[PDB]
Amino acid sequence: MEMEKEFEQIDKSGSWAAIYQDIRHEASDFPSRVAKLPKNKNRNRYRDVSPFDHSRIKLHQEDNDYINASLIKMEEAQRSYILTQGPLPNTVGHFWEMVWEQKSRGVVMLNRVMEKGSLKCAQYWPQKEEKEMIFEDTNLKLTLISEDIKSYYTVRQLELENLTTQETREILHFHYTTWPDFGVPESPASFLNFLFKVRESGSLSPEHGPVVVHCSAGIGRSGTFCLADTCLLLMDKRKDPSSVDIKKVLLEMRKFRMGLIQTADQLRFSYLAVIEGAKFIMGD
Ligand SMILES: O=C(O)C1c2ccccc2Oc2ccccc21
């Protein structure tokens, strides 16, 4: 069923809350035993958001390999994403260790450091060129190279170098700064413009490690970004683009991380974004 007609049918019937609860009911439940070990309590931002054991990212260290981060591997679409929480004061070094070890080119940030008057993640990147950051626990140095501030978002060029050797890779940083909590972007227009800037950078392409995507919990806004990207890629690949079922793609993605899409409004906005974005994919 053309999603655009499925969309109008749900809107006219006002059944978004009903559709959303049906997804919640059918979603995978896998163990998260490593996340719940007492040694890891200060590595989790939210008691109720944990990576499954089968899909969690492992840090390359013998001491403690745990980070709140999941590998979402889309087979039909040939895209991978790492979804993670906003870094905590004691996990900013782990965060950059993961980017290094997984060979990522891009970090996508969908939250502000402060929202609703509370801290939603650590200030984990440098704000001035001449004030670099050193992460002593993981032996990394991070330098701001350049910053491009636009109306809806900011792009930063960062230098990451192995202080174990001398390997130097440049990481890009895509910061959406207008998205509110459990809320929706302004018009899917600015969110789609942002998604197309990440794509144009190379950050989502198979010559690199998976993109790192976060918000505060790494399930709501983060979920909306990977769901919209994968659904548009499928529409581009298939003989019949009307065969793309957004609810079925979401349930596939929920095999790899719990809770993706946090509200019925986030589900509705994901539909809107894919419907408006398809008007480019199909040749306009
Ligand atoms: O499709 C593939 O060749 C491969 C893959 C194979 C089986 C299952 C999942 C899967 O995911 C991805 C994701 C990105 C790139 C390649 C793959």
mmCIF file with all atom_site columns, C-alpha atoms in Angstrom, residues 14 49 56 69 96-97 162 234 250:
data_model
loop_
_atom_site.group_PDB
_atom_site.id
_atom_site.type_symbol
_atom_site.label_atom_id
_atom_site.label_alt_id
_atom_site.label_comp_id
_atom_site.label_asym_id
_atom_site.label_entity_id
_atom_site.label_seq_id
_atom_site.pdbx_PDB_ins_code
_atom_site.Cartn_x
_atom_site.Cartn_y
_atom_site.Cartn_z
_atom_site.occupancy
_atom_site.B_iso_or_equiv
_atom_site.pdbx_formal_charge
_atom_site.auth_seq_id
_atom_site.auth_comp_id
_atom_site.auth_asym_id
_atom_site.auth_atom_id
_atom_site.pdbx_PDB_model_num
ATOM 1 C CA . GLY A 1 14  ? -6.338 9.792  14.019 1.00 0.00 ? 14  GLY A CA 1
ATOM 2 C CA . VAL A 1 49  ? 17.942 2.175  27.468 1.00 0.00 ? 49  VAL A CA 1
ATOM 3 C CA . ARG A 1 56  ? 26.661 -4.137 21.078 1.00 0.00 ? 56  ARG A CA 1
ATOM 4 C CA . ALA A 1 69  ? 26.253 1.661  21.508 1.00 0.00 ? 69  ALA A CA 1
ATOM 5 C CA . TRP A 1 96  ? 36.378 8.666  20.717 1.00 0.00 ? 96  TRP A CA 1
ATOM 6 C CA . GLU A 1 97  ? 38.065 5.201  21.159 1.00 0.00 ? 97  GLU A CA 1
ATOM 7 C CA . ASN A 1 162 ? 46.559 7.582  17.150 1.00 0.00 ? 162 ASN A CA 1
ATOM 8 C CA . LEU A 1 234 ? 15.375 1.062  -0.639 1.00 0.00 ? 234 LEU A CA 1
ATOM 9 C CA . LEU A 1 250 ? 11.454 -0.069 11.710 1.00 0.00 ? 250 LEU A CA 1
#
